[PDB]
């Protein structure tokens, strides 16, 4: 219906394409037949997760088998580890915007060559919540920055303020997929996707602190009153790009606290451990349910 | 003589400070007795390049042993990975400025509590090389943004313009050691730190492209005329994170490319590896050339 468009012409005018960071080249693996069937991309923080989820989303549809399976397919940078289970492309992506833009840049063409039409790209990860007790899966509406507006900025030799819608109907299908289970609170809200974990995020335990709590309260509570329900680092970008690759994006991010009470956490180890496994638990069944019905 | 200064008041009024990305904490591992030695931090992107260096500095000073040493010292995230050999603290950072600031902020907490005075901090990586034959190890002067301005901008809930100079004493001592290793090009200059690998850099093979060749080399040629000799995406935050909290900064990068004449490279696979090892060979050289000199 619609296929992975890349607004790049000069790819046409190239004998051969190499994707440095994953370890992939063209005129070696055949993109059409290798990668053309994958209807869901899905990325996460650390190949300590997306490896697991590439085993779980293999468990749900039944691509599961007793042998040593789903061996990591991408390399070059040990930063990017990949798998391929069925139509699913489970791909970790490091920390923060620039890490996640490469993966998303070289996954776009990685599909375009494959010719992918139907591929949903969803970010699983973690975050901190504003106004949202621990364990709630704040799906993303837009990608705000530091001025509570739905725009990430992309210097290109110069400017480029790119929008960051998350993909309504898709979000509706994730929402309809954690309301089709009921075991965890699954609400929606805008995200402050930030570039500095310590100062950007309000926090009071970095190494360059020129504000207090009375003034981190203001911001956070201005994040809340402005639309923002969830704090992380990769997602504005991750909605600028996919909205301008004709690729439906979404972010699925357990909040690991409500920073209206603090800056470090309270529940013991076992509590964080289910929370942490809920974005995939809802992303993997959300997925099986698009593989059942397709 | 010169300790590691943390610019945070609330760090004193704190019971136990955890480091969420190193899994470290300060109420298990005695920082002083463990981490008081270190007088250099060395970093890069992948784990298989920093492990190669950490098992490399240990045979270059004469503390190596034949059993399974150099075992990873920080988990929680698999993204980051570090080993401590002698007075060296090697740690991978991954990609972007966002990742590298997370390693830097808790490290400089970890090194402050340790009472470490002397801890130079060094980066070692890859970069496209404006106006430099493939392989010249550009040693960074200043880390400028998209308008050639030696300032890095920080989000601080809406706030601070930090600078980005590399420590001039260690720069000399890292150019003063590879004409002590005279078998590899060793130039100095400025560098641009771009939050996005295609359009920030300005490359004709991504997905979201608005500019031609003619408009590509207009930008690189005017960055050359400024002092930019190479392009990677971690250094402006690395340069400024160091200057602030007092750290002596250096960025020692090989170039793979000359972007005035391409966006993809030309020489063999065996030609890049030896180029890919020109950061460490200078670094461990300049490390030992102090380790002996103390």
Asked if the Cβ–Cβ distance from B79 to A46 is below 8 Å, we say: yes
Enumerate the residues of chain B whose CB falls inside 8 A of the CB of residue A199.
Answer: 154-157
Backbone angles phi, psi at B52, to 5 degrees: -65, -35
Asked if the Cβ–Cβ distance from A211 to B99 is below 8 Å, we say: no
Q: How many CB pairs below 8 Å do chains A and B form together?
A: 206
User: Which burial class, exposed, middle or buried, applies to B91 when counting CB atoms under 10 A from its CB (0-12, 13-18, 19+)?
Assistant: buried
Asked if the Cβ–Cβ distance from B145 to A155 is below 8 Å, we say: yes
DSSP lists the bridge partners of residue B25 as B18
Asked if the Cβ–Cβ distance from A199 to B96 is below 8 Å, we say: no
Contact A167, A248 (CB under 8 A): yes
Enumerate the residues of chain A whose CB falls inside 8 A of the CB of residue B264.
Answer: 18
Reduced to 3 states (helix: H, G, I; strand: E, B; else coil), residue B244 is helix
Domains defined for chain B, CATH in brackets: 1-294 (3.40.50.1580)
Nearest to A156 among B77, B157, B199 (CB): B199
Asked if the Cβ–Cβ distance from A8 to B204 is below 8 Å, we say: yes
Asked if the Cβ–Cβ distance from B202 to A98 is below 8 Å, we say: no
Asked if the Cβ–Cβ distance from B79 to A95 is below 8 Å, we say: yes
CA torsion through residues A186, A191, A192, A194, sign: positive
Task: Report the chain A residue with the minimal C-alpha distance to residue B112.
Answer: A207
CA torsion through residues B76, B20, B101, B110, sign: negative
> What distance in Å separates residue B247's CA from the closest CA in chain A?
12
CA B247/CA B91 separation, integer angstroms: 16
CA B63 centroid distance within chain: 24
DSSP conformation letters of chain A: ------B-STTTS-S--EETTTTEE-----HHHHHTT--EEEEES-TTTHHHHHHHHHHHHT---SSS-------SSTT--B--BTTEEEEE--SHHHHHHHHHHHHHHHHHHHT-SS-EEEEEEEEEESS--TT---B-SBEE-TTSSS-EE--SSS--EE--B--HHHHHHHHHHHTTT-SS---B-EEEE-S-TTTTT--SSSSB----SHHHHHHHHHHHHHTEEEEESSTTHHHHHHHTTT--EEEEEEEEEETTS-SS--S-HHHHHHHTTHHHHHHHHHHHHHHHH-
Nearest to B207 among A108, A211, A219 (CB): A108
Helix axes B168-175, B278-291, angle to 10 degrees: 110
CA A19/CA A37 separation, integer angstroms: 20
Nearest to A202 among B96, B157, B159 (CB): B157
Asked if the Cβ–Cβ distance from A209 to B95 is below 8 Å, we say: no
Contact A35, A111 (CB under 8 A): yes
Helices (H), B46-201: 47-61, 96-113, 168-175
CA B256/CA B128 separation, integer angstroms: 6
Resolution (A): 2.8
- Obtained via which technique? X-ray
Chosen from A205, A220, A262 to mutate, greatest number of chain B CBs within 10 A: A205
């Amino acid at each position: 219906t619609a296929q992975v468009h890349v607004r790049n012409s000069h790819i046409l005018e190239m004998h051969s394409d190499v994707l440095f960071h994953i370890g992939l080249t063209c005129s070696r693996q055949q993109v059409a037949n290798t990668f053309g069937d994958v209807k869901f991309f899905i990325t996460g923080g650390s190949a300590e997760r997306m490896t697991h989820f590439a085993q779980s989303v293999a468990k749900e549809l039944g691509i599961t088998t007793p042998y040593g399976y789903q061996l990591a397919p991408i390399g070059s940078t040990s930063r990017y580890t990949l798998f391929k289970v069925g139509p699913v492309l489970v791909a970790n992506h490091g920390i923060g915007m620039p890490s996640i833009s490469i993966l998303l840049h070289e996954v776009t063409k990685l599909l375009e060559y494959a010719g992918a039409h139907g591929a949903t790209y969803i970010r699983m990860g973690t975050s901190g919540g504003i106004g949202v007790e621990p364990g709630t899966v704040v799906i993303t509406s837009e990608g705000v920055n530091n001025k509570l507006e739905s725009v990430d900025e992309v210097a290109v030799l110069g400017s480029t303020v790119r929008r960051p819608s998350i993909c309504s109907p898709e979000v509706r299908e994730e929402i309809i997929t954690a309301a089709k289970e009921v075991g965890l609170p699954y609400a929606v809200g805008k995200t402050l996707s930030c570039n500095d974990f310590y100062e950007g995020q309000g926090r009071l335990d970095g190494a360059i602190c020129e504000y207090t709590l009375e003034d981190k309260m203001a911001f956070l509570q201005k994040l809340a009153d402005a639309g923002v329900r969830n704090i992380e680092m990769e997602a504005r970008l991750m909605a600028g790009f996919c909205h301008k690759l004709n690729i439906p994006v979404a972010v699925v991010c357990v909040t690991l606290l409500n920073r209206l009470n603090g800056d470090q956490v309270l529940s013991s180890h076992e509590t964080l451990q289910d929370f942490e496994r809920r974005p995939g638990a809802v992303l993997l069944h959300y997925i099986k349910s698009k593989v059942n019905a397709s």
